[PDB]
Short mmCIF file of C-alpha atoms and ligand atoms in Angstrom, two decimals:
data_model
loop_
_atom_site.label_atom_id
_atom_site.label_comp_id
_atom_site.label_asym_id
_atom_site.label_seq_id
_atom_site.Cartn_x
_atom_site.Cartn_y
_atom_site.Cartn_z
CA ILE A 3 108.25 49.57 138.15
CA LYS A 4 105.45 48.19 140.50
CA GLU A 5 103.23 50.03 143.03
CA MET A 6 103.87 48.90 146.63
CA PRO A 7 101.07 47.28 148.70
CA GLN A 8 100.03 49.10 151.93
CA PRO A 9 98.03 47.75 154.92
CA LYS A 10 94.69 49.19 156.08
CA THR A 11 94.50 52.93 157.02
CA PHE A 12 92.76 54.95 159.77
CA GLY A 13 92.07 58.26 158.02
CA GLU A 14 94.51 61.04 159.09
CA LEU A 15 96.43 58.48 161.31
CA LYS A 16 97.27 56.45 158.12
CA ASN A 17 98.81 53.10 159.29
CA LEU A 18 99.87 54.25 162.82
CA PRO A 19 97.02 52.51 164.80
CA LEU A 20 98.27 49.09 163.49
CA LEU A 21 101.16 49.47 166.02
CA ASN A 22 98.72 50.20 168.92
CA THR A 23 99.27 46.63 170.29
CA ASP A 24 101.60 45.01 172.88
CA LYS A 25 102.92 42.85 169.95
CA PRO A 26 103.74 45.18 167.04
CA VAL A 27 106.53 43.00 165.45
CA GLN A 28 104.16 40.00 165.38
CA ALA A 29 101.44 42.31 163.84
CA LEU A 30 103.93 43.43 161.12
CA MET A 31 104.82 39.73 160.48
CA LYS A 32 101.08 38.96 159.83
CA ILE A 33 100.90 42.01 157.46
CA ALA A 34 104.03 40.70 155.62
CA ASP A 35 102.38 37.25 155.25
CA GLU A 36 99.31 38.96 153.58
CA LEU A 37 101.10 41.66 151.47
CA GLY A 38 104.39 39.86 150.61
CA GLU A 39 108.04 40.83 150.39
CA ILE A 40 107.55 44.65 150.59
CA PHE A 41 104.89 47.07 151.93
CA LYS A 42 104.63 50.80 152.58
CA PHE A 43 103.80 51.92 156.12
CA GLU A 44 102.73 55.58 156.66
CA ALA A 45 102.31 57.60 159.90
CA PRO A 46 101.65 61.37 160.32
CA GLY A 47 104.88 62.89 158.96
CA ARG A 48 106.78 59.66 158.08
CA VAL A 49 106.95 56.75 155.62
CA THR A 50 108.96 53.50 155.78
CA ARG A 51 108.94 50.27 153.72
CA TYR A 52 109.07 46.83 155.42
CA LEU A 53 111.24 44.24 153.61
CA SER A 54 110.70 40.47 154.12
CA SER A 55 112.36 38.65 151.14
CA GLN A 56 116.04 37.65 150.82
CA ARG A 57 115.68 38.86 147.17
CA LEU A 58 115.23 42.50 148.37
CA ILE A 59 117.19 42.35 151.67
CA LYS A 60 120.40 41.18 149.86
CA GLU A 61 120.20 44.56 148.02
CA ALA A 62 119.39 46.54 151.20
CA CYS A 63 122.56 44.98 152.77
CA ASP A 64 124.73 46.70 150.06
CA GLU A 65 126.66 49.29 152.16
CA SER A 66 127.47 51.31 148.97
CA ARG A 67 123.68 51.96 148.57
CA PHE A 68 122.26 51.86 152.17
CA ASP A 69 123.53 52.88 155.67
CA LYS A 70 122.06 52.24 159.17
CA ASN A 71 119.07 54.47 160.01
CA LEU A 72 117.96 55.17 163.61
CA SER A 73 114.38 53.82 163.68
CA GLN A 74 111.99 55.78 165.97
CA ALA A 75 112.64 53.06 168.62
CA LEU A 76 116.42 53.76 168.50
CA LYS A 77 115.89 57.61 168.58
CA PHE A 78 113.84 57.16 171.85
CA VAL A 79 116.52 54.74 173.27
CA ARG A 80 119.16 57.42 172.34
CA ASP A 81 117.66 59.67 175.12
CA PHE A 82 119.50 57.30 177.57
CA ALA A 83 122.02 55.38 175.28
CA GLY A 84 123.33 58.64 173.71
CA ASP A 85 126.03 58.31 171.04
CA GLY A 86 126.91 54.81 172.24
CA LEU A 87 127.65 52.41 169.32
CA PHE A 88 124.03 51.14 169.02
CA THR A 89 122.30 54.58 168.79
CA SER A 90 125.04 56.54 166.88
CA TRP A 91 124.90 57.52 163.19
CA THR A 92 127.79 56.02 161.10
CA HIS A 93 128.84 59.64 160.25
CA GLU A 94 129.19 60.81 163.93
CA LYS A 95 132.87 61.08 165.01
CA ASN A 96 132.16 58.93 168.13
CA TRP A 97 130.82 55.92 166.10
CA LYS A 98 134.08 55.12 164.22
CA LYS A 99 136.21 56.18 167.23
CA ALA A 100 134.37 53.87 169.72
CA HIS A 101 134.19 51.13 167.00
CA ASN A 102 138.01 51.23 166.51
CA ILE A 103 138.67 51.31 170.31
CA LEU A 104 136.20 48.53 171.23
CA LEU A 105 136.64 46.01 168.32
CA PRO A 106 139.68 44.34 169.97
CA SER A 107 137.69 43.96 173.28
CA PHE A 108 134.93 41.99 171.37
CA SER A 109 137.05 39.64 169.28
CA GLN A 110 137.16 35.83 169.47
CA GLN A 111 140.66 36.39 171.10
CA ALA A 112 139.22 38.65 173.88
CA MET A 113 136.67 35.91 174.72
CA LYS A 114 139.53 33.83 176.25
CA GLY A 115 139.94 36.62 178.84
CA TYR A 116 136.13 36.85 179.58
CA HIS A 117 135.61 33.05 179.79
CA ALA A 118 136.41 32.66 183.59
CA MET A 119 133.89 35.47 184.46
CA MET A 120 131.22 33.82 182.19
CA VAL A 121 131.84 30.46 183.93
CA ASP A 122 131.41 32.19 187.38
CA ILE A 123 127.84 33.26 186.47
CA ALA A 124 127.01 29.98 184.55
CA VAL A 125 128.04 27.96 187.64
CA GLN A 126 125.64 30.15 189.76
CA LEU A 127 122.75 29.23 187.40
CA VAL A 128 123.57 25.47 187.51
CA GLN A 129 123.83 25.55 191.37
CA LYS A 130 120.44 27.42 191.61
CA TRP A 131 118.74 24.65 189.55
CA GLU A 132 120.62 21.85 191.45
CA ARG A 133 119.14 23.30 194.69
CA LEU A 134 115.48 23.32 193.59
CA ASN A 135 113.17 20.95 195.52
CA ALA A 136 111.32 18.06 193.73
CA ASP A 137 108.01 20.02 193.51
CA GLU A 138 109.64 23.07 191.86
CA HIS A 139 109.92 24.53 188.32
CA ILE A 140 112.19 27.01 186.49
CA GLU A 141 111.03 30.44 185.21
CA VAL A 142 113.18 30.26 182.04
CA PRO A 143 113.41 33.90 180.72
CA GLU A 144 113.63 35.19 184.36
CA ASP A 145 116.70 32.94 185.07
CA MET A 146 118.28 33.57 181.61
CA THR A 147 117.95 37.35 182.24
CA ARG A 148 119.55 36.95 185.71
CA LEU A 149 122.46 35.17 183.98
CA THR A 150 123.02 37.49 180.95
CA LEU A 151 122.75 40.75 182.95
CA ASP A 152 125.22 39.39 185.58
CA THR A 153 127.72 38.24 182.86
CA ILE A 154 127.86 41.65 181.12
CA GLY A 155 128.09 43.41 184.54
CA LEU A 156 131.13 41.31 185.53
CA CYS A 157 132.84 41.41 182.03
CA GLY A 158 131.66 45.02 181.44
CA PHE A 159 132.90 46.79 184.59
CA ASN A 160 133.67 44.07 187.25
CA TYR A 161 130.31 44.84 188.95
CA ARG A 162 128.19 42.05 190.53
CA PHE A 163 124.43 42.67 190.07
CA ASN A 164 124.01 39.45 192.20
CA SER A 165 120.73 38.71 190.33
CA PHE A 166 120.62 35.09 191.71
CA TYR A 167 120.44 36.61 195.29
CA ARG A 168 117.28 38.67 194.44
CA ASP A 169 113.55 38.38 193.61
CA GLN A 170 113.47 42.18 193.00
CA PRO A 171 115.85 43.51 190.29
CA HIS A 172 118.79 45.77 191.27
CA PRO A 173 117.65 49.50 191.27
CA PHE A 174 119.67 50.33 188.09
CA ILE A 175 117.72 47.50 186.32
CA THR A 176 114.26 48.73 187.51
CA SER A 177 115.21 52.18 185.98
CA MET A 178 116.63 50.68 182.70
CA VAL A 179 113.61 48.38 182.16
CA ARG A 180 111.19 51.33 182.85
CA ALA A 181 113.13 53.65 180.41
CA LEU A 182 113.05 50.89 177.70
CA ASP A 183 109.26 50.48 178.33
CA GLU A 184 108.66 54.27 177.97
CA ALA A 185 110.81 54.42 174.76
CA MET A 186 108.86 51.53 173.16
CA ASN A 187 105.44 52.85 174.42
CA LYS A 188 106.18 56.41 173.04
CA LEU A 189 106.11 54.82 169.51
CA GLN A 190 102.36 54.07 169.63
CA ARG A 191 101.09 57.54 170.70
CA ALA A 192 99.10 59.33 167.92
CA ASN A 193 98.86 62.26 170.43
CA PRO A 194 102.25 62.33 172.32
CA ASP A 195 102.21 65.87 173.89
CA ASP A 196 98.81 65.20 175.70
CA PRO A 197 98.96 65.85 179.51
CA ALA A 198 97.81 62.19 180.16
CA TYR A 199 101.51 61.37 179.30
CA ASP A 200 103.00 64.02 181.71
CA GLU A 201 103.75 61.49 184.56
CA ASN A 202 105.51 59.12 182.07
CA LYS A 203 107.85 61.98 180.95
CA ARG A 204 108.64 62.89 184.63
CA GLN A 205 109.50 59.19 185.49
CA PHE A 206 111.75 58.82 182.35
CA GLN A 207 113.94 61.77 183.59
CA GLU A 208 114.33 60.19 187.10
CA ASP A 209 115.23 56.80 185.43
CA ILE A 210 117.86 58.43 183.17
CA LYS A 211 119.35 60.22 186.27
CA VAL A 212 119.49 56.82 188.13
CA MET A 213 121.34 55.08 185.25
CA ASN A 214 123.82 58.00 184.77
CA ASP A 215 124.53 58.33 188.54
CA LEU A 216 125.36 54.58 189.06
CA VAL A 217 127.38 54.45 185.81
CA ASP A 218 129.21 57.84 186.31
CA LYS A 219 130.13 56.79 189.91
CA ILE A 220 131.44 53.38 188.64
CA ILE A 221 133.71 55.24 186.13
CA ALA A 222 134.85 57.85 188.75
CA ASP A 223 135.48 55.03 191.38
CA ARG A 224 137.56 53.04 188.84
CA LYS A 225 139.75 56.09 187.84
CA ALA A 226 140.18 56.96 191.60
CA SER A 227 141.35 53.43 192.62
CA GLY A 228 143.50 53.17 189.41
CA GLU A 229 143.06 49.32 189.37
CA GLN A 230 143.51 47.48 186.02
CA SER A 231 140.88 44.64 185.86
CA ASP A 232 140.56 43.02 182.37
CA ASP A 233 136.99 44.30 181.74
CA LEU A 234 135.54 46.57 178.98
CA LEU A 235 135.79 49.60 181.30
CA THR A 236 139.63 49.15 181.68
CA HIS A 237 139.99 48.86 177.82
CA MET A 238 137.86 52.08 177.35
CA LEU A 239 139.85 54.10 179.97
CA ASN A 240 143.29 53.11 178.46
CA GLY A 241 142.31 52.70 174.76
CA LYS A 242 143.29 55.15 172.00
CA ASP A 243 141.65 55.24 168.55
CA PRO A 244 144.49 54.49 166.04
CA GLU A 245 142.95 57.04 163.52
CA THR A 246 142.44 60.16 165.77
CA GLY A 247 144.92 59.00 168.56
CA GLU A 248 142.20 60.15 171.02
CA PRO A 249 140.55 58.16 173.87
CA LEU A 250 136.79 58.07 174.59
CA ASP A 251 135.57 60.81 176.96
CA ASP A 252 133.92 59.83 180.29
CA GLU A 253 130.40 60.69 178.98
CA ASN A 254 130.82 58.41 175.90
CA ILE A 255 132.13 55.57 178.16
CA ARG A 256 128.93 55.93 180.21
CA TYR A 257 126.76 55.66 177.01
CA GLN A 258 128.78 52.51 175.97
CA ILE A 259 128.25 50.90 179.44
CA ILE A 260 124.48 51.63 179.37
CA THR A 261 124.37 50.22 175.79
CA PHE A 262 126.12 46.98 176.86
CA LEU A 263 123.79 46.53 179.89
CA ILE A 264 120.71 46.96 177.61
CA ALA A 265 122.14 44.33 175.19
CA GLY A 266 122.98 41.82 177.98
CA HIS A 267 119.55 42.21 179.66
CA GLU A 268 117.47 42.05 176.44
CA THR A 269 119.08 39.94 173.65
CA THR A 270 121.25 37.00 174.83
CA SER A 271 118.58 36.09 177.45
CA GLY A 272 115.94 35.91 174.62
CA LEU A 273 118.21 33.60 172.57
CA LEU A 274 118.80 31.18 175.53
CA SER A 275 115.04 31.21 176.32
CA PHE A 276 114.00 30.48 172.67
CA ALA A 277 116.76 27.83 172.36
CA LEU A 278 115.48 25.94 175.43
CA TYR A 279 111.87 26.32 174.14
CA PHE A 280 112.79 24.71 170.79
CA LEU A 281 114.82 21.93 172.46
CA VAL A 282 111.93 20.89 174.83
CA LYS A 283 109.51 21.02 171.80
CA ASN A 284 111.96 18.82 169.70
CA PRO A 285 113.18 15.90 171.85
CA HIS A 286 115.32 14.27 169.07
CA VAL A 287 117.19 17.61 168.72
CA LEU A 288 117.53 17.94 172.55
CA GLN A 289 118.96 14.36 172.66
CA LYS A 290 121.65 15.08 169.94
CA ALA A 291 122.66 18.34 171.71
CA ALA A 292 122.79 16.61 175.15
CA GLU A 293 125.01 13.86 173.58
CA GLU A 294 127.49 16.54 172.29
CA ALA A 295 127.56 18.29 175.72
CA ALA A 296 128.31 14.96 177.50
CA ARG A 297 131.12 14.04 175.01
CA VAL A 298 132.83 17.49 174.95
CA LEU A 299 132.41 18.93 178.52
CA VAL A 300 134.56 16.25 180.28
CA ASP A 301 135.80 18.60 183.10
CA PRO A 302 133.79 20.01 186.05
CA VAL A 303 134.43 23.59 184.71
CA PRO A 304 134.21 24.06 180.88
CA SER A 305 137.30 25.55 179.18
CA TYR A 306 137.29 28.10 176.31
CA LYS A 307 138.60 25.38 173.91
CA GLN A 308 135.75 23.01 174.91
CA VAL A 309 133.08 25.67 174.26
CA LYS A 310 134.61 26.11 170.71
CA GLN A 311 133.93 22.31 170.14
CA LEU A 312 130.19 22.49 170.95
CA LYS A 313 129.41 22.74 167.19
CA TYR A 314 125.87 21.23 167.33
CA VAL A 315 124.97 23.53 170.27
CA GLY A 316 126.20 26.43 168.01
CA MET A 317 123.78 25.17 165.27
CA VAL A 318 120.89 24.95 167.83
CA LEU A 319 121.53 28.61 168.74
CA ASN A 320 121.60 29.69 165.03
CA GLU A 321 118.32 27.77 164.35
CA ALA A 322 116.69 29.57 167.38
CA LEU A 323 117.94 32.90 165.93
CA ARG A 324 116.45 31.85 162.56
CA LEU A 325 112.88 31.30 163.85
CA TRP A 326 112.87 33.95 166.64
CA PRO A 327 115.65 36.53 166.14
CA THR A 328 115.42 38.30 169.52
CA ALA A 329 116.52 41.60 167.96
CA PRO A 330 113.75 41.52 165.34
CA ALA A 331 114.46 44.47 162.98
CA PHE A 332 116.96 47.07 161.80
CA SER A 333 116.51 50.19 159.70
CA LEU A 334 118.38 51.50 156.60
CA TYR A 335 118.33 54.74 154.54
CA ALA A 336 119.21 55.07 150.84
CA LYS A 337 122.55 56.97 150.50
CA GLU A 338 121.52 58.04 146.94
CA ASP A 339 118.58 57.54 144.53
CA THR A 340 118.53 53.82 143.63
CA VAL A 341 116.16 51.07 142.42
CA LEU A 342 115.32 48.11 144.68
CA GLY A 343 114.90 44.70 142.92
CA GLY A 344 114.46 46.43 139.51
CA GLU A 345 110.86 47.41 140.56
CA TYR A 346 110.84 49.91 143.51
CA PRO A 347 112.51 53.32 142.93
CA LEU A 348 113.81 55.03 146.11
CA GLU A 349 115.10 58.61 146.56
CA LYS A 350 118.15 59.64 148.66
CA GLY A 351 117.04 59.51 152.35
CA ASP A 352 114.14 56.99 151.86
CA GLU A 353 113.94 54.55 154.84
CA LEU A 354 113.62 50.71 154.94
CA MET A 355 112.88 48.33 157.85
CA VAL A 356 114.26 44.78 157.64
CA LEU A 357 111.73 42.42 159.33
CA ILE A 358 114.22 39.72 160.37
CA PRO A 359 111.68 37.05 161.47
CA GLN A 360 110.06 37.16 157.99
CA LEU A 361 113.44 37.12 156.13
CA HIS A 362 114.18 33.91 158.13
CA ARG A 363 110.86 32.39 156.83
CA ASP A 364 111.59 32.90 153.08
CA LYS A 365 110.58 29.51 151.55
CA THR A 366 112.68 30.24 148.42
CA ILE A 367 115.77 30.00 150.76
CA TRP A 368 114.87 27.47 153.45
CA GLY A 369 112.35 25.17 151.60
CA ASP A 370 108.81 24.01 152.61
CA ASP A 371 109.99 22.79 156.13
CA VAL A 372 110.68 26.52 157.02
CA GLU A 373 108.58 26.43 160.28
CA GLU A 374 110.46 23.26 161.53
CA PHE A 375 113.36 23.45 164.06
CA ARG A 376 116.25 21.76 162.19
CA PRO A 377 119.74 22.87 163.33
CA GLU A 378 121.33 20.71 160.56
CA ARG A 379 120.33 23.63 158.18
CA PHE A 380 123.55 25.31 159.46
CA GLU A 381 126.06 22.46 158.73
CA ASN A 382 127.56 24.35 155.72
CA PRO A 383 127.52 28.20 155.62
CA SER A 384 128.58 28.04 151.90
CA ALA A 385 125.21 26.31 151.15
CA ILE A 386 123.26 29.35 152.56
CA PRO A 387 122.53 32.19 150.09
CA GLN A 388 124.05 35.63 150.74
CA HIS A 389 122.16 37.74 153.34
CA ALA A 390 119.60 34.99 154.08
CA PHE A 391 120.42 34.99 157.85
CA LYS A 392 120.78 38.40 159.58
CA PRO A 393 120.16 38.03 163.37
CA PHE A 394 123.22 40.27 164.15
CA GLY A 395 122.38 42.94 161.52
CA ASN A 396 124.63 43.91 158.60
CA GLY A 397 128.12 45.08 157.63
CA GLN A 398 130.16 47.62 159.67
CA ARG A 399 126.98 48.30 161.75
CA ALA A 400 126.52 44.58 162.66
CA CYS A 401 126.40 43.55 166.33
CA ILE A 402 129.83 44.16 167.97
CA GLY A 403 128.73 41.71 170.73
CA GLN A 404 128.09 38.69 168.41
CA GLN A 405 131.17 36.65 169.57
CA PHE A 406 130.43 37.54 173.23
CA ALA A 407 126.73 36.57 173.00
CA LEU A 408 127.41 33.27 171.15
CA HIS A 409 130.28 32.28 173.52
CA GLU A 410 128.12 32.92 176.63
CA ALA A 411 125.05 31.18 175.10
CA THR A 412 127.08 28.15 173.91
CA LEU A 413 128.82 27.79 177.35
CA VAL A 414 125.56 28.04 179.34
CA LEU A 415 123.41 25.88 177.02
CA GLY A 416 126.25 23.27 177.00
CA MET A 417 126.33 23.21 180.87
CA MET A 418 122.47 23.09 181.04
CA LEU A 419 122.39 20.04 178.68
CA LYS A 420 125.29 18.38 180.53
CA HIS A 421 123.73 18.75 184.04
CA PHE A 422 119.91 18.33 183.59
CA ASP A 423 117.12 16.54 181.72
CA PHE A 424 114.21 18.94 180.96
CA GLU A 425 110.45 18.43 181.01
CA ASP A 426 107.88 20.77 179.32
CA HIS A 427 105.54 19.91 182.24
CA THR A 428 102.79 22.48 181.28
CA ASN A 429 102.85 21.84 177.45
CA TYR A 430 103.80 25.55 177.23
CA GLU A 431 102.03 27.54 174.46
CA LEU A 432 104.51 30.05 172.96
CA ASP A 433 103.61 33.62 174.07
CA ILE A 434 106.10 36.19 172.78
CA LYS A 435 106.48 39.35 174.85
CA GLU A 436 107.91 42.42 173.02
CA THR A 437 110.22 44.98 174.71
CA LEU A 438 113.24 46.27 172.82
CA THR A 439 113.44 42.53 171.94
CA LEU A 440 111.46 39.29 171.73
CA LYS A 441 111.24 36.82 174.63
CA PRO A 442 109.06 33.88 175.60
CA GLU A 443 106.73 35.04 178.40
CA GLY A 444 105.66 32.54 181.10
CA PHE A 445 107.91 29.78 179.70
CA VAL A 446 108.48 27.24 182.57
CA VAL A 447 110.18 23.80 182.68
CA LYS A 448 111.16 21.15 185.26
CA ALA A 449 114.83 20.17 185.38
CA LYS A 450 115.85 16.74 186.79
CA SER A 451 119.52 16.73 187.82
CA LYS A 452 121.81 14.11 186.21
CA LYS A 453 123.75 14.56 189.57
CA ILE A 454 127.11 15.34 187.85
CA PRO A 455 129.40 17.29 190.23
CA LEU A 456 130.74 20.83 189.48
C1 LIG B 1 121.80 37.18 170.75
C2 LIG B 1 122.33 38.32 171.21
C3 LIG B 1 122.34 39.55 170.38
C4 LIG B 1 121.68 39.85 169.23
C5 LIG B 1 120.65 39.00 168.52
C6 LIG B 1 122.09 41.17 168.84
C7 LIG B 1 121.60 41.79 167.69
C8 LIG B 1 122.03 43.01 167.22
C9 LIG B 1 121.64 43.57 166.00
C10 LIG B 1 120.62 43.01 165.05
C11 LIG B 1 122.34 44.74 165.86
C12 LIG B 1 122.20 45.69 164.69
C13 LIG B 1 121.13 46.76 165.04
C14 LIG B 1 120.86 47.78 163.95
O1 LIG B 1 121.33 47.68 162.77
O2 LIG B 1 120.11 48.76 164.28
C15 LIG B 1 123.17 44.85 167.04
C16 LIG B 1 124.03 45.90 167.27
C17 LIG B 1 124.77 46.02 168.43
N1 LIG B 1 124.84 45.11 169.43
FE1 LIG B 1 123.98 43.42 169.58
N2 LIG B 1 122.99 41.64 169.71
C18 LIG B 1 123.21 40.71 170.66
C19 LIG B 1 124.05 40.76 171.77
C20 LIG B 1 124.87 41.83 172.09
C21 LIG B 1 125.78 41.92 173.16
C22 LIG B 1 126.07 40.85 174.18
C23 LIG B 1 126.39 43.16 173.08
C24 LIG B 1 127.41 43.82 173.93
C25 LIG B 1 127.88 43.31 175.04
C26 LIG B 1 125.79 43.83 171.95
C27 LIG B 1 126.11 45.09 171.52
C28 LIG B 1 125.68 45.64 170.33
C29 LIG B 1 126.21 46.94 169.89
C30 LIG B 1 127.14 47.81 170.70
C31 LIG B 1 125.65 47.17 168.68
C32 LIG B 1 125.89 48.38 167.83
C33 LIG B 1 127.15 48.10 166.95
C34 LIG B 1 127.53 49.27 166.05
O3 LIG B 1 126.66 49.79 165.28
O4 LIG B 1 128.71 49.72 166.09
N3 LIG B 1 124.90 43.00 171.39
N4 LIG B 1 122.97 43.78 167.86
C1 LIG B 2 116.75 45.45 168.76
C2 LIG B 2 116.07 46.72 168.34
C3 LIG B 2 114.82 46.43 167.59
C4 LIG B 2 114.16 47.74 167.26
C5 LIG B 2 113.12 47.37 166.25
C6 LIG B 2 112.01 48.36 166.19
C7 LIG B 2 110.83 47.73 166.91
N1 LIG B 2 109.71 48.57 166.55
C8 LIG B 2 108.65 48.48 167.56
C9 LIG B 2 107.37 48.69 166.78
C10 LIG B 2 107.68 47.78 165.58
C11 LIG B 2 109.15 48.06 165.26
C12 LIG B 2 109.33 49.06 164.14
O1 LIG B 2 109.15 48.73 162.97
N2 LIG B 2 109.66 50.29 164.44
C13 LIG B 2 109.71 51.37 163.52
C14 LIG B 2 108.26 51.75 163.08
C15 LIG B 2 107.63 52.90 163.80
C16 LIG B 2 108.11 54.18 163.66
C17 LIG B 2 107.55 55.25 164.36
C18 LIG B 2 106.49 55.03 165.23
C19 LIG B 2 106.02 53.73 165.38
C20 LIG B 2 106.60 52.68 164.67
C21 LIG B 2 110.51 52.43 164.14
O2 LIG B 2 110.79 52.34 165.36
O3 LIG B 2 110.92 53.41 163.50
#
């Protein structure tokens, strides 16, 4: 029974000022490097414990002992994502109902139906880059975000955001990005109810109204027309939960659509951006991935079955998720009193944060080459210890979008490596911007066409 380390305190504010930074996850990573596999973090009125070791996280991932907690970040996102899957408690009726209704829409099988839509957007990205002039470069996270938002819009509700036709984001997106910024900024405020934050609160309410009005009109317009497109919205209007026999209500459908647009904007785009970053920093790895793409993608348009055969590209994406998991944490609560790792007693209700980037750096799992980009680490999942690799979270509350994200990312990265050579022309220094998620900021490359027709 050990006493837990705790980082430096600021009197009555305890640890809270440590998060007064534009890079709080990267600050918590540096604290974990100093304090080790577990530390206590206190703010006025709340305590959590940050876990970094596979030794403790494998226990935290025991669903008989721990359930998903809404972190303060998720509670603030819930003001616009409601009781959508991502911001619902496991015990709320609408979690299991929506989970049962939506699981078939997110399976490996369902991906065959979404593939043609994903290819539509992927072809738009390839044509954009084919059409750049000799003097020009690519804004990587900008273009990956254009792609991943457009893909979920088209597969979500058959809506074209037409992001490759715009410098300025669609108005829904300007509102969603500003709401996500206010949710994440609200975290840092020692003094939240101050009047210096009164404009922020007024803007948040306008942004919520914007997201609701576009999404509610999309739903209303679809029911009115009665058309049956094979998108998530059609599945949610016609689907019944096998348990309750009930469908989702129109308000819950709107929370699910907002949730899916947040995920498509924030997470998959981060993964593609980090994957291209590691490939241009690791030319031998880029070469082996480009060789797979050339051998497998033998048709102008990739097929679903071809994407399934891009195994090495799959390993590249997992190794990018290992070093920079774009969704960097999740939160758990103890269902009952229990002891963590035979050292740290917890009471019913005590909270934990899993710091995924640190878990993925555990040298007892990955060895001394832990900072190196080596996709071959992922050749044999049976050779990886339990709960060592958690970029999609844990158990019944794991990412429902995992198959969707990995299909889209494998397809697009495979087409990028087929069609272009890449140059890191600025010798880019990694700068990680934090929103809901992690993304390279300012990452730019030059892409020289291999002139292979679409
Ligand atoms: C690389 C891409 C992505 C990553 C890394 C990612 C990561 C995660 C993680 C870590 C969680 C667990 C969060 C927690 O325990 O608090 C999660 C949940 C979720 N993700 Fe994703 N996600 C990705 C893409 C997507 C996509 C494309 C969708 C939907 C189109 C999506 C929808 C969701 C939903 C709905 C949940 C909540 C599931 C539930 O609790 O029932 N994600 N994601
Ligand atoms: C993909 C979603 C990732 C969300 C990860 C959370 C991302 N947080 C952003 C800051 C770091 C990280 C986190 O540890 N937050 C906790 C801690 C906390 C609670 C209350 C006030 C301030 C901070 C929380 O939100 O409860």
